[PDB]
Design a protein around this ligand. Sequence first.
Ligand SMILES: N[C@@H](CCC(=O)N[C@@H](CSc1ccc([N+](=O)[O-])cc1[N+](=O)[O-])C(=O)NCC(=O)O)C(=O)O
Ligand SMILES: N[C@@H](CCC(=O)N[C@@H](CSc1ccc([N+](=O)[O-])cc1[N+](=O)[O-])C(=O)NCC(=O)O)C(=O)O
Lengths: 225, 225
Amino acid sequence: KPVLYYFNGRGKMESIRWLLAAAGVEFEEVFLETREQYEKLLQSGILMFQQVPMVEIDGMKLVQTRAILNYIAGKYNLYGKDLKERALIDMYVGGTDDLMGFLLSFPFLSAEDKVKQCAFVVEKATSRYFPAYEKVLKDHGQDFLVGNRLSWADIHLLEAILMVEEKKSDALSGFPLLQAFKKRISSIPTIKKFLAPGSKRKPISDDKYVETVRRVLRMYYDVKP
Amino acid sequence: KPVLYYFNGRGKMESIRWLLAAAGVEFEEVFLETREQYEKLLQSGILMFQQVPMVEIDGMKLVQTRAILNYIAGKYNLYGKDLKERALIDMYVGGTDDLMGFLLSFPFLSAEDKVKQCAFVVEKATSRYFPAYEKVLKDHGQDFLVGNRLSWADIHLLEAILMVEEKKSDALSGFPLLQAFKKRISSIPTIKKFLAPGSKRKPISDDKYVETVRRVLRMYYDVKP
Ligand SMILES: N[C@@H](CCC(=O)N[C@@H](CSc1ccc([N+](=O)[O-])cc1[N+](=O)[O-])C(=O)NCC(=O)O)C(=O)O
Ligand SMILES: N[C@@H](CCC(=O)N[C@@H](CSc1ccc([N+](=O)[O-])cc1[N+](=O)[O-])C(=O)NCC(=O)O)C(=O)O
């Protein structure tokens, strides 16, 4: 059973939690709460680059979020059928990875910049990413982004859709296909379960999360928008 | 055949030029010298997310640097031989990607910020990245990072090493295996050629470059370290 080393919040580990749940894969979590728990980890040398996320899976101590997702997508057949499909999946994931990235430092921002950051994110979504994914689905008319079947690109897009809707409830208005897309993917048994209450899915990160990360890593004390 | 659309400089495209070159793949380049070219590109809509780099290859208009690199590594067998090896390659690439990432804005940085960033990068190279790779090479004693054969990870690490040494010629001091690694990988025919004069390899980005980028995209004027 894979073990996820990160803090007790979303951050970069959330997308990992999603993919594993989507693959219907049971997993354990290890949360960093104290600076000494971390330093103890550095001492063991299990974090190749001194960072987290880190995931022990199949005898590996994988670090680097994209390497972790890539491996999981591949291991569970959520990475397409050939190089071409994977290329499309990677191009799509890169988009949502950028979009979600804009919300990763939100909890570390100040009320002042949070207001600005929210504006920036939503705008990027309605003017850049939603149009792009809405277009893919339209010109393809299929039920999924790639290969007419559930793939990691679909799962990454849904998570990003929901993160934006958490900021602007009506952000999907004007994107009928994406709306239908949301219903389909959200009803997949595994994803449906991950969305139901009581899952390991994490809520939006808050001060407690931020504060913990700062004590543990001694950084990001002044994250800029 | 493949056509790389980007500015006439390094930026995020340099890594792509590196991999293609190492794989023995000739390519064309289209530079953006005017705010016009861009606005015209947006019209055609060949930029899924309105961004560059973008590469036309095998009938695709691929955007998102990593998706492009991933595809190229896969197509020309520089991505290992199984999901496990791919994971290690993606993990290594993650590190060099962050390391080179820290230099990607360097040219846009102020006179003083550059000296701040310079030390930062060097700090990361000697205290975080170089050690990690030195350790990998030491643990299995092979000439290549993974699968005892040239991989994308070897190519990315070599580019990263040079970018660092361009800022500090003695950055590899204390990393003998990496020093031996530098010579070995550089000796490989395709790479030796890419490193020889007259190749499509880009020099350190100058003020001219920064100005052009700022023009074509009307962004990146206040880039912080
Ligand atoms: N490229 C690596 C980057 C990993 C990384 O930056 N890890 C951070 C924690 S995550 C993180 C750290 C800061 C913020 N932030 O918003 O300030 C958001 C997140 N996040 O995961 O969303 C870390 O361990 N830092 C310690 C160090 O570098 O010394 C990856 O994708 O996995
Ligand atoms: N995730 C995408 C990100 C692409 C991206 O940011 N592209 C930029 C140009 S590259 C770039 C732009 C600015 C700086 N900078 O240092 O300021 C460095 C680079 N770079 O490639 O290294 C762009 O097109 N921007 C226009 C827009 O957002 O509308 C990828 O990796 O390809």
